[PDB]
Amino acid sequence: GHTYFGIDYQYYRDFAENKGKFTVGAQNIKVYNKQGQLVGTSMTKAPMIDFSVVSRNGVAALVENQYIVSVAHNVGYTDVDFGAEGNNPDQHRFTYKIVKRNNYKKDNLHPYEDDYHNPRLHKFVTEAAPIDMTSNMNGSTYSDRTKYPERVRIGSGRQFWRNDQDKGDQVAGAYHYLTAGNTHNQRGAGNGYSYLGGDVRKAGEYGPLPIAGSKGDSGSPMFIYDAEKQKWLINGILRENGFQLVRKSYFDEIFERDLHTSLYTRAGNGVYTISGNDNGQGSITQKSGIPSEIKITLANMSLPLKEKDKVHNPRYDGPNIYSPRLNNGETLYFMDQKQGSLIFASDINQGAGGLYFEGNFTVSPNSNQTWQGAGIHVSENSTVTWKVNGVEHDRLSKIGKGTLHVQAKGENKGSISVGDGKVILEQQADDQGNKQAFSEIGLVSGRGTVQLNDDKQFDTDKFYFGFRGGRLDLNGHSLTFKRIQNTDEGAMIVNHNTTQAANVTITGNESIVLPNGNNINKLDYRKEIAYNGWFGETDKNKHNGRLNLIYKPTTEDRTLLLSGGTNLKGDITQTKGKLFFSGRPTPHAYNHLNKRWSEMEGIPQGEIVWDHDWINRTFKAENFQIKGGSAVVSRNVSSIEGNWTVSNNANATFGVVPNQQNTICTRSDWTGLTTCQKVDLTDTKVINSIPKTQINGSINLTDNATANVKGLAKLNGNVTLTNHSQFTLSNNATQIGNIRLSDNSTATVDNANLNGNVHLTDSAQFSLKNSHFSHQIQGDKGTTVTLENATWTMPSDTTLQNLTLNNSTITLNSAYSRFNTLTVNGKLSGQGTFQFTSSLFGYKSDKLKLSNDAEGDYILSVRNTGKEPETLEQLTLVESKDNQPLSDKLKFTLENDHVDAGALRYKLVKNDGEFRLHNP
């Protein structure tokens, strides 16, 4: 298509991929031109369309579970696929095959032009919900912009951008990638058609991003928003541009041709028996109803797998490939109001025919009969007990809001894609002890759930969350993964069991030594693995059962990246390796442009990632037990909630520091690869975009554990240390809470803000560097407090043991800028300043109480109020803790050399073993 070079190409790419700000449902997206000026606001009258119904190759759209729409003259393509762009193998993109083209035939009862077809696919599509069609064939219907306020199109035809002189550069050939936007303005319409066209340089009546089609865009879909229904509908297919309106009545004729057999037993508890053979002939016997026997059509093996379909217009001649063998199968519809039964008397290959179930059914083999077909659709509130195995190298498609309770015997060699509703896994062991539900299991489209009703149902290496994921409900069971295959934040691991807890263990990749051969999956041999999804249920109306997460790699050099979220009623445990809690870059459409046009556009080749444009995440658990290795809470984490226990030689670090390098872990949407690397955080825009992490919990360090809260982070909780643990608050981070040190632990506040109190015992040490502190410090026998380049404003009477000063100032009383005393029971040493307040009139003041061990060089500064004393006494400033005299190694100097209280001049003297203010 043709875009406007006056607007960033990225808009049109993001639009098509539902990336950047154009996520599904989003509204009011501002669109600026290259001059940074507002062109318009997008999607002000409709939630952003879900383009997942459009095939990756842009030439078709999903209008039913196994049907697409396109132009007949697209005579070459034989299949479609869906989902997100890229080559991340976790996605397991599926190739849906056309088995019947359904090229329109113009005739007395089919008035419209024959460049139009409704292909049937060989499987039910699971990755996306089909889109409804508009029903009126009069183009004028859709001109009303109150009823139809938004209109969009999308395609992969030859790509151009046009400048202000309307000159086009062709930046890509057809079928390379998708571009999209709103359509051009309404430009004339009639029976079966509509024309849209206008000036790409200009904002249109459907929005700031008008886009026209070109060679290769034929067949691509055009969508219209019905504001009354609140639905996006497909309105037409591209044939300025002309569109052939969609044909709902024609589609109905195709559909009813493939689905015409309804099995139903009026009294309920129907019993049906099915059999067939390789020549595509089949039969369904109904226990009692008349007729007892119903003939059905199945996959016909005597027919070619490929053949040339009907061609009704000589212009649209070409390969026109279809599958007479698969298309022979009809779709069956079973309804029962009580408990129905379906018995497999023989293997069944339905070909492109599928199964719909309305009501509960028990489906059972007489022996070991298998099934194979388009897929299974189970109605809302219906449960289908499925006791029939599948076929090797065949994928079963499960759709519908209902439940599929899998309960066949032995090792099922078929796989499954769970697009909608629920699949319960409960395969039974065979006589030989073999038990496997599927050889491979995927959750896609976010609508589906896999629920475990037994152990050892599948190989966890063969389970994946594909495009938009879904729910894996452990239902009280436990699993171990090496790595979890996942594509995005749609991935959810939960436990809906109210009664039994569940555990997920992640062990990381077995080896990081590359194998040989010619189909290496690099994801399996990397030190870094990642999970983009959720642990724990976020839906308030679903049960968030107990769920624990354990990261237990084999080697110290293995990383697990969590970039989605946790809502765990349970703990997260780390035994080794590296564990990152992180936000992630906002997704953006990949840049397919060559060197030249990339340079013209001013964007890098390949992956588009903006350092200032990240998604913010939240994490929550009951406890974080870091028993070993290293846990890191990195950038764009809004909050992490739960209590921390770091033990042995483990470590936990919170926050990234502006103007330094930080290790940043990100996974590529394009390859699925995770990369951890030191990155400079120096850009103002980037720095300002990163939230200060709210750490909502307390921290306990034991043994040799270390914890570090730094930079863009705020600890909303206490820290407790024992043994030889160490805690550091630095780089302008903040803590709202207390620090409690025992044994041989250590704490340090380096250029940071501790809003709370410190309490040491035993041999603990507290260090305050390059900071100001205005709270309480309590230290007893054995403990050492140290200040360096620091100021401390004491709030009240305080006791310490040893205290070491170095270019630091202690203000004894908050009134300096009723009276307090600092007692140093142990050794004071070093050099610095003490700031005093006093009332010479009452001969009262702040006090510094020292022991025989005191020593060093200090400055005394005194602020006195009010009156001149009505008597002559001495005011003690520095005294001994008892009657012994202060050391001669102790040296004090009064600032300004003297203190005046009216006409009375006091100086500093060492008299009788103490330092007093004296009047000569």
Place this chain on the structure above:
Amino acid sequence: GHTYFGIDYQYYRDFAENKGKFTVGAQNIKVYNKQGQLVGTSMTKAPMIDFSVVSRNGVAALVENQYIVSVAHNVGYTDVDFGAEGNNPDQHRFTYKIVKRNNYKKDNLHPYEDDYHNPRLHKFVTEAAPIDMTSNMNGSTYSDRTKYPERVRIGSGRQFWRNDQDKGDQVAGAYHYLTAGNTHNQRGAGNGYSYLGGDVRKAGEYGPLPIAGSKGDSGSPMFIYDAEKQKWLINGILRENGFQLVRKSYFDEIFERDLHTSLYTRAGNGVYTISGNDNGQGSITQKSGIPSEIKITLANMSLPLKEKDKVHNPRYDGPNIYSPRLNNGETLYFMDQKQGSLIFASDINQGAGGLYFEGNFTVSPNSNQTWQGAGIHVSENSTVTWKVNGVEHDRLSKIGKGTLHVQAKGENKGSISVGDGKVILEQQADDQGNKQAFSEIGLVSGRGTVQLNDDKQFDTDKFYFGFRGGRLDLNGHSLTFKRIQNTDEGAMIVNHNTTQAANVTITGNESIVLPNGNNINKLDYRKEIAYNGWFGETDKNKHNGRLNLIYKPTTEDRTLLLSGGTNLKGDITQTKGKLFFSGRPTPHAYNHLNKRWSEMEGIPQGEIVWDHDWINRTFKAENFQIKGGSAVVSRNVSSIEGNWTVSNNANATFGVVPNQQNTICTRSDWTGLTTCQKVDLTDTKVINSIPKTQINGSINLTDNATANVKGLAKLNGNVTLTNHSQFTLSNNATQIGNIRLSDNSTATVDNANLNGNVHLTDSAQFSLKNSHFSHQIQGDKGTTVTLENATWTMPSDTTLQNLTLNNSTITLNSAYSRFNTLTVNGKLSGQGTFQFTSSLFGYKSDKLKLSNDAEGDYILSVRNTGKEPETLEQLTLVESKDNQPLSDKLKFTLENDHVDAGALRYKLVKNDGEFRLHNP
């Protein structure tokens, strides 16, 4: 004398010592016999006599400042002393020496019998005010019992008690101790005499305790109450018993013989110059008046210190010792209406002559002249500026209501006894820098005041409050004591300065290791010291200036007992050791009886202390700052008022517990020694005699501080706790106020009554054991409430975090014996009962809202009112705080298994994650 064995000997002993109920001024003292029957009521028509005017040896009474009265035939005694019984060295009892006997000579102008003398003492007596004499010599005068309703006597003659057969046991020899009571009945009187006599077994016209004299009682005084004057007067001296009436006219002749020189200058501003020499010759020069020179007599050193006085009756021959040398001195009287002057041109030794000053005087040495004499009497409203030093080993006696402003130079080696009025200390340093007002200073008789007008005026170890004490007015100055020498509650330390605060520091005894040598003062080497007096002014008409008290011993094992009172405008601070606020046993006369007669009387040998008979005390300060050590409020403290702050590892304990041992601190009146020891409190009479201490203030605990209110105590205030402080209310004590816990503090109510609310935050804990509680408890994140063997009746909606039950019951609503909800946001656990009220008719009830953490075994009891429901619903009783279901570890059981509302039967079920009342 002779007492009645039918009445406790203690009455007669207490009477003589003004102890038990017979304190000075007391009235209506009931006297019971050994059969517990009322014999009579004592002192119904006069306030109890002050026997302090009677010499300790019982043979004389104080009739003027330096004169006594007795019989001439008492020819052996050479001195007298006064005060209280016992050997407490703090009393510094003084030996007053007879310098002239003044044996009566019968002649034409002296009609009466010559067994009578009026001894002159060498010093003015400071410990007691002299008593007036009756003036009529006709014995019949005093028979009128309307005018003279009360009459008493006292002596130390041979001691007997007589039984109902009037048989005497002699229980002690003469001159061992004093006994006293009212006199016998009037039995004949004439010129110069009176006889009193009757039956000791019987109550007499002067009261229930008639007492007769015996051998050794000769000379002892007999007193009569003049009801018109409202005075006790001495009426006669003992010679059934005969008494020689007192001779007022004879005494006047003696007095005028010794005091006949009045110095006076009509125009005011008189100027007198005094000199003398060793031969007892002296001179006073008057500036201008005629004659200019007046001869005076002084101590005559050429005369013997001892000699035999005049003997007028050969029967009364014997030693008759007097002091011709001291008696030679005459007393001088100086009056001036403006400002008079007295100049010492030479040292002066007045001997037994003293000084009276009426009006203001300046008394000055030309050089370093000293003075020595009987004492100084300064008139009311007169000030005598005294610039003359004293003499080593000589005590100066200060009496009169006027002021003595001491302002001499250098180190005065004399001491002083301040009996009356005011002495201001302002010694000036000499050229060499020596400065000392007196080598020793005592306050006695409660009438006197020492006021400090400078620092370093005396050694605080040499200052004492003797018999009945007096006021030490710090007047804005500060002092430190090791121990304060004090005898009784007459001791007062105050600060009358309206402008400058004052501090008293008490440090305790320097060492507790006994010295060697043969004059050890045990009081100086004990761990326990005590102060029987007051801190702060109690007189409303005097200024109660700011005064602070600091107890700061060196070692943890040192105790300070305060058994008197405080009324401090200021604080009490404790840094270490043990501090007791206590009442004290009522004083009782010491038991001098041997083994035999003690056993007969049924009383212990030695000190008489009754465990049920204690004096109740009050204490008041602004703040009690217990910064270290232990503060204890012990038995017989009516109230202690002020706010408490207990910090560091300090402790404060209130109340004694019935039926347990309590540490009781008491000081012996007899030895001055303080003893602290565990004592069982098991006697009903003792228990009932102890008041419940009203603690009138609030309590703040910080750091590791602990406080304990228990037993006979009531806290009328709030408690606030921080850090790791702990507070316990136990043993049936009561608190009217709230408890507020923060940080890691803890509170417990063990079998006690908390009338108020509890509020926890952070990690605080509240424990309720073996108690019933009916007020509010509020606890948020982190906090734990615990009940053991307790019931709690919630008053309104309540929120807690964690809650632990153990054999305890929570009644959700006060109506159980409009609806309330208890929310437990955190973990509930344990076992117990919840009592509910409900209205099934409206489907409303009390609620228990729990979280996922809830667990344990509980009983649900439900009381329902009124109607049968006109609809069928479920009534939720126990619910979740949100949509998650309650744990399976949570178990409830409905009491009685069911609830009925008319014909409708509801049972308890767990339905949909909640516990509801359900109708099958």
